[PDB]
Short mmCIF file of all heavy atoms in Angstrom, two decimals:
data_model
loop_
_atom_site.label_atom_id
_atom_site.label_comp_id
_atom_site.label_asym_id
_atom_site.label_seq_id
_atom_site.Cartn_x
_atom_site.Cartn_y
_atom_site.Cartn_z
N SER A 1 -11.86 26.50 18.33
CA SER A 1 -13.01 26.08 17.55
C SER A 1 -13.23 24.55 17.63
O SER A 1 -12.32 23.79 18.01
CB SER A 1 -12.84 26.50 16.10
OG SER A 1 -11.81 25.75 15.49
N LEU A 2 -14.41 24.13 17.21
CA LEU A 2 -14.78 22.74 17.21
C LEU A 2 -13.96 21.94 16.18
O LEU A 2 -13.50 20.82 16.46
CB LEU A 2 -16.27 22.63 16.85
CG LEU A 2 -16.99 21.31 17.03
CD1 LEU A 2 -16.78 20.82 18.47
CD2 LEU A 2 -18.45 21.51 16.72
N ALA A 3 -13.69 22.55 15.04
CA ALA A 3 -12.93 21.93 13.95
C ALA A 3 -11.51 21.54 14.38
O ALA A 3 -10.94 20.58 13.87
CB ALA A 3 -12.92 22.83 12.74
N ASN A 4 -10.96 22.29 15.33
CA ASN A 4 -9.62 22.02 15.87
C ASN A 4 -9.70 20.79 16.78
O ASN A 4 -8.86 19.89 16.69
CB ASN A 4 -9.12 23.21 16.66
CG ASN A 4 -8.48 24.24 15.78
OD1 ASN A 4 -7.38 24.07 15.27
ND2 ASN A 4 -9.18 25.34 15.55
N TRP A 5 -10.70 20.79 17.67
CA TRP A 5 -10.93 19.68 18.58
C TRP A 5 -11.17 18.40 17.80
O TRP A 5 -10.74 17.31 18.18
CB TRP A 5 -12.17 19.93 19.48
CG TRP A 5 -12.00 20.95 20.58
CD1 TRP A 5 -12.74 22.08 20.74
CD2 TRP A 5 -11.11 20.88 21.70
NE1 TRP A 5 -12.36 22.73 21.88
CE2 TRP A 5 -11.36 22.01 22.50
CE3 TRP A 5 -10.13 19.96 22.12
CZ2 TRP A 5 -10.67 22.27 23.70
CZ3 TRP A 5 -9.45 20.21 23.31
CH2 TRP A 5 -9.72 21.35 24.09
N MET A 6 -11.90 18.51 16.68
CA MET A 6 -12.20 17.40 15.80
C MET A 6 -10.92 16.94 15.10
O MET A 6 -10.73 15.74 14.92
CB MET A 6 -13.22 17.80 14.72
CG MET A 6 -14.67 17.88 15.22
SD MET A 6 -15.31 16.29 15.72
CE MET A 6 -15.29 15.38 14.15
N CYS A 7 -10.07 17.89 14.72
CA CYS A 7 -8.80 17.57 14.07
C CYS A 7 -7.87 16.82 15.06
O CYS A 7 -7.16 15.87 14.71
CB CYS A 7 -8.14 18.85 13.57
SG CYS A 7 -6.59 18.60 12.66
N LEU A 8 -7.96 17.25 16.31
CA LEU A 8 -7.17 16.64 17.36
C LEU A 8 -7.60 15.23 17.62
O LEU A 8 -6.79 14.31 17.57
CB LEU A 8 -7.30 17.46 18.66
CG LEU A 8 -6.57 16.83 19.85
CD1 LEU A 8 -5.09 16.84 19.54
CD2 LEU A 8 -6.89 17.53 21.17
N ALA A 9 -8.90 15.03 17.92
CA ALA A 9 -9.44 13.70 18.18
C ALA A 9 -9.10 12.76 17.02
O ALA A 9 -8.78 11.58 17.22
CB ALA A 9 -10.97 13.79 18.39
N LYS A 10 -9.23 13.26 15.79
CA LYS A 10 -8.94 12.51 14.58
C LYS A 10 -7.52 11.97 14.56
O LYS A 10 -7.28 10.76 14.51
CB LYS A 10 -9.14 13.42 13.34
CG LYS A 10 -8.71 12.78 12.03
CD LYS A 10 -9.64 11.65 11.68
CE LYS A 10 -9.23 10.91 10.43
NZ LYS A 10 -10.31 9.96 10.04
N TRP A 11 -6.54 12.86 14.61
CA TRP A 11 -5.15 12.45 14.58
C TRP A 11 -4.64 11.70 15.84
O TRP A 11 -3.78 10.82 15.73
CB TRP A 11 -4.26 13.62 14.22
CG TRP A 11 -4.46 14.01 12.81
CD1 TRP A 11 -5.11 15.12 12.34
CD2 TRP A 11 -4.09 13.23 11.66
NE1 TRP A 11 -5.17 15.07 10.96
CE2 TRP A 11 -4.55 13.93 10.52
CE3 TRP A 11 -3.41 12.01 11.47
CZ2 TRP A 11 -4.35 13.46 9.21
CZ3 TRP A 11 -3.22 11.53 10.20
CH2 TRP A 11 -3.69 12.25 9.06
N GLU A 12 -5.22 12.00 16.98
CA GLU A 12 -4.80 11.35 18.22
C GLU A 12 -5.28 9.91 18.38
O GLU A 12 -4.49 9.02 18.73
CB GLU A 12 -5.27 12.16 19.45
CG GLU A 12 -4.59 13.51 19.68
CD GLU A 12 -3.13 13.42 20.15
OE1 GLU A 12 -2.71 12.35 20.67
OE2 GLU A 12 -2.40 14.44 20.01
N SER A 13 -6.56 9.67 18.14
CA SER A 13 -7.19 8.37 18.30
C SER A 13 -8.02 7.85 17.12
O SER A 13 -8.40 6.66 17.10
CB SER A 13 -8.09 8.43 19.53
OG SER A 13 -9.16 9.35 19.32
N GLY A 14 -8.34 8.71 16.18
CA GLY A 14 -9.18 8.28 15.07
C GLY A 14 -10.60 8.22 15.58
O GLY A 14 -11.42 7.38 15.18
N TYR A 15 -10.89 9.13 16.53
CA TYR A 15 -12.21 9.24 17.15
C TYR A 15 -12.52 7.95 17.94
O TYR A 15 -13.67 7.53 17.99
CB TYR A 15 -13.29 9.45 16.07
CG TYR A 15 -13.04 10.55 15.02
CD1 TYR A 15 -13.33 10.33 13.68
CD2 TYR A 15 -12.60 11.82 15.40
CE1 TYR A 15 -13.18 11.34 12.72
CE2 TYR A 15 -12.45 12.86 14.46
CZ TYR A 15 -12.75 12.59 13.13
OH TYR A 15 -12.65 13.59 12.18
N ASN A 16 -11.50 7.37 18.59
CA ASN A 16 -11.60 6.12 19.35
C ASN A 16 -11.42 6.35 20.86
O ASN A 16 -10.36 6.76 21.31
CB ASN A 16 -10.49 5.17 18.84
CG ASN A 16 -10.61 3.75 19.37
OD1 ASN A 16 -11.54 3.43 20.11
ND2 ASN A 16 -9.66 2.92 19.01
N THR A 17 -12.47 6.05 21.64
CA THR A 17 -12.42 6.25 23.09
C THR A 17 -11.61 5.17 23.84
O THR A 17 -11.19 5.39 24.97
CB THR A 17 -13.83 6.35 23.72
OG1 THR A 17 -14.53 5.12 23.51
CG2 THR A 17 -14.62 7.49 23.07
N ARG A 18 -11.46 4.00 23.21
CA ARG A 18 -10.73 2.88 23.82
C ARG A 18 -9.22 2.99 23.57
O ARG A 18 -8.43 2.20 24.14
CB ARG A 18 -11.13 1.53 23.18
CG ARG A 18 -12.53 1.08 23.41
CD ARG A 18 -12.64 -0.37 23.01
NE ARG A 18 -12.23 -1.27 24.09
CZ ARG A 18 -11.41 -2.28 23.98
NH1 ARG A 18 -10.86 -2.56 22.80
NH2 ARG A 18 -11.16 -3.06 25.04
N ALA A 19 -8.82 3.88 22.68
CA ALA A 19 -7.43 4.05 22.32
C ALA A 19 -6.48 4.27 23.48
O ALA A 19 -6.74 5.08 24.37
CB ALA A 19 -7.29 5.17 21.28
N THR A 20 -5.43 3.46 23.52
CA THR A 20 -4.40 3.60 24.56
C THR A 20 -3.08 3.41 23.85
O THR A 20 -3.00 2.64 22.89
CB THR A 20 -4.48 2.58 25.71
OG1 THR A 20 -4.37 1.24 25.19
CG2 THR A 20 -5.77 2.74 26.53
N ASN A 21 -2.07 4.14 24.30
CA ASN A 21 -0.76 3.98 23.73
C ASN A 21 0.25 4.11 24.84
O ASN A 21 0.27 5.09 25.58
CB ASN A 21 -0.48 5.00 22.62
CG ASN A 21 0.23 4.40 21.45
OD1 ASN A 21 -0.34 3.58 20.70
ND2 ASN A 21 1.51 4.75 21.27
N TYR A 22 1.02 3.04 25.01
CA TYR A 22 2.05 3.01 26.02
C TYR A 22 3.33 3.64 25.49
O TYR A 22 3.71 3.40 24.34
CB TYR A 22 2.32 1.57 26.46
CG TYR A 22 3.40 1.46 27.51
CD1 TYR A 22 3.23 2.00 28.79
CD2 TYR A 22 4.60 0.82 27.22
CE1 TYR A 22 4.22 1.86 29.75
CE2 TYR A 22 5.58 0.68 28.17
CZ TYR A 22 5.41 1.20 29.43
OH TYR A 22 6.39 1.04 30.36
N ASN A 23 3.96 4.42 26.36
CA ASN A 23 5.19 5.09 26.00
C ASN A 23 6.32 4.43 26.81
O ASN A 23 6.53 4.74 27.99
CB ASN A 23 5.08 6.59 26.35
CG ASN A 23 3.98 7.29 25.54
OD1 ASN A 23 3.97 7.27 24.31
ND2 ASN A 23 3.04 7.89 26.24
N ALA A 24 7.03 3.53 26.15
CA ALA A 24 8.12 2.78 26.77
C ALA A 24 9.21 3.69 27.32
O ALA A 24 9.78 3.43 28.39
CB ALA A 24 8.73 1.77 25.77
N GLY A 25 9.44 4.77 26.59
CA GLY A 25 10.46 5.76 26.97
C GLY A 25 10.33 6.34 28.35
O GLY A 25 11.35 6.60 28.99
N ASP A 26 9.09 6.66 28.79
CA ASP A 26 8.92 7.23 30.11
C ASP A 26 7.90 6.47 30.98
O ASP A 26 7.52 6.94 32.03
CB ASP A 26 8.54 8.71 30.03
CG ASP A 26 7.16 8.94 29.41
OD1 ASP A 26 6.49 7.98 28.98
OD2 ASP A 26 6.75 10.12 29.37
N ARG A 27 7.46 5.34 30.44
CA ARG A 27 6.50 4.48 31.12
C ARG A 27 5.15 5.13 31.43
O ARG A 27 4.55 4.88 32.47
CB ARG A 27 7.12 3.88 32.40
CG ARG A 27 8.39 3.04 32.18
CD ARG A 27 8.90 2.47 33.52
NE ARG A 27 10.28 1.97 33.44
CZ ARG A 27 10.63 0.73 33.15
NH1 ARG A 27 9.70 -0.19 32.93
NH2 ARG A 27 11.90 0.38 33.12
N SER A 28 4.66 5.98 30.53
CA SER A 28 3.37 6.61 30.70
C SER A 28 2.47 6.11 29.57
O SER A 28 2.96 5.54 28.59
CB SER A 28 3.48 8.13 30.65
OG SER A 28 3.78 8.57 29.33
N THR A 29 1.17 6.35 29.71
CA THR A 29 0.18 5.91 28.72
C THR A 29 -0.83 6.99 28.34
O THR A 29 -1.29 7.74 29.21
CB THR A 29 -0.57 4.65 29.25
OG1 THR A 29 0.38 3.64 29.61
CG2 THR A 29 -1.52 4.09 28.19
N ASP A 30 -1.13 7.08 27.05
CA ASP A 30 -2.12 8.02 26.53
C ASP A 30 -3.44 7.28 26.47
O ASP A 30 -3.51 6.18 25.90
CB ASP A 30 -1.74 8.46 25.12
CG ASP A 30 -0.41 9.15 25.06
OD1 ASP A 30 -0.09 9.90 26.01
OD2 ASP A 30 0.32 8.86 24.10
N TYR A 31 -4.48 7.90 27.00
CA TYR A 31 -5.80 7.29 27.07
C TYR A 31 -6.91 8.04 26.38
O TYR A 31 -6.99 9.27 26.41
CB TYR A 31 -6.22 7.14 28.54
CG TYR A 31 -5.34 6.21 29.37
CD1 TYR A 31 -4.24 6.68 30.06
CD2 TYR A 31 -5.66 4.85 29.47
CE1 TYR A 31 -3.45 5.85 30.83
CE2 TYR A 31 -4.88 3.99 30.25
CZ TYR A 31 -3.78 4.50 30.93
OH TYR A 31 -3.04 3.67 31.74
N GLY A 32 -7.79 7.26 25.72
CA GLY A 32 -8.95 7.82 25.08
C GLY A 32 -8.88 8.60 23.81
O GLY A 32 -7.82 8.75 23.16
N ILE A 33 -10.02 9.15 23.46
CA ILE A 33 -10.19 9.93 22.24
C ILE A 33 -9.19 11.07 22.05
O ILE A 33 -8.79 11.34 20.88
CB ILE A 33 -11.64 10.45 22.13
CG1 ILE A 33 -11.90 11.04 20.75
CG2 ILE A 33 -11.93 11.42 23.26
CD1 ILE A 33 -13.39 11.15 20.41
N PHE A 34 -8.76 11.72 23.13
CA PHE A 34 -7.80 12.80 23.00
C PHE A 34 -6.38 12.37 23.37
O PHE A 34 -5.46 13.19 23.37
CB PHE A 34 -8.20 13.98 23.88
CG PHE A 34 -9.51 14.63 23.46
CD1 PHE A 34 -10.52 14.83 24.39
CD2 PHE A 34 -9.74 14.98 22.13
CE1 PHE A 34 -11.76 15.36 24.02
CE2 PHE A 34 -10.98 15.52 21.74
CZ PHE A 34 -11.97 15.72 22.68
N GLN A 35 -6.22 11.09 23.71
CA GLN A 35 -4.91 10.54 24.10
C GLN A 35 -4.23 11.42 25.15
O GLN A 35 -3.19 12.04 24.92
CB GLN A 35 -4.00 10.32 22.88
CG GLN A 35 -4.49 9.28 21.90
CD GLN A 35 -4.23 7.84 22.37
OE1 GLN A 35 -3.14 7.33 22.18
NE2 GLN A 35 -5.26 7.22 22.93
N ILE A 36 -4.86 11.51 26.30
CA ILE A 36 -4.38 12.31 27.41
C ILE A 36 -3.38 11.46 28.19
O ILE A 36 -3.61 10.28 28.44
CB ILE A 36 -5.54 12.75 28.31
CG1 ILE A 36 -6.40 13.74 27.49
CG2 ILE A 36 -5.01 13.34 29.60
CD1 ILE A 36 -7.69 14.19 28.16
N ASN A 37 -2.24 12.07 28.53
CA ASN A 37 -1.15 11.37 29.20
C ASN A 37 -1.25 11.21 30.71
O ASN A 37 -1.41 12.19 31.45
CB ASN A 37 0.16 12.06 28.83
CG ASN A 37 1.35 11.26 29.25
OD1 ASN A 37 1.96 11.54 30.28
ND2 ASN A 37 1.68 10.26 28.46
N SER A 38 -1.04 9.97 31.17
CA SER A 38 -1.14 9.63 32.59
C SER A 38 -0.05 10.22 33.47
O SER A 38 -0.19 10.24 34.69
CB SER A 38 -1.11 8.11 32.77
OG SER A 38 0.15 7.59 32.35
N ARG A 39 1.07 10.62 32.88
CA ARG A 39 2.16 11.16 33.63
C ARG A 39 1.78 12.49 34.23
O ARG A 39 2.32 12.86 35.26
CB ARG A 39 3.38 11.34 32.73
CG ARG A 39 4.57 12.01 33.42
CD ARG A 39 5.86 11.55 32.76
NE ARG A 39 6.05 10.11 32.98
CZ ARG A 39 6.30 9.57 34.16
NH1 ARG A 39 6.44 10.36 35.23
NH2 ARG A 39 6.46 8.27 34.30
#
């Protein structure tokens, strides 16, 4: 459902498309609204 996707975007990025988070542990980065992993 849409409400799930909305819940995801909310907790992952706060509905932020510029959001990036570097993972020092494995050297990968989460990008965008859904924080998709580069690894």
Side-chain angles (χ1 to χ4, degrees):
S1 69
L2 191 54
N4 277 286
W5 286 121
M6 283 294 295
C7 183
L8 176 66
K10 174 68 184 189
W11 291 107
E12 291 289 340
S13 64
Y15 310 137
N16 190 1
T17 63
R18 294 193 85 228
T20 59
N21 221 70
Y22 178 67
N23 298 303
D26 67 356
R27 301 182 196 267
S28 70
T29 305
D30 300 321
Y31 296 90
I33 190 162
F34 297 128
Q35 295 282 278
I36 294 175
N37 191 260
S38 66
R39 176 153 295 293

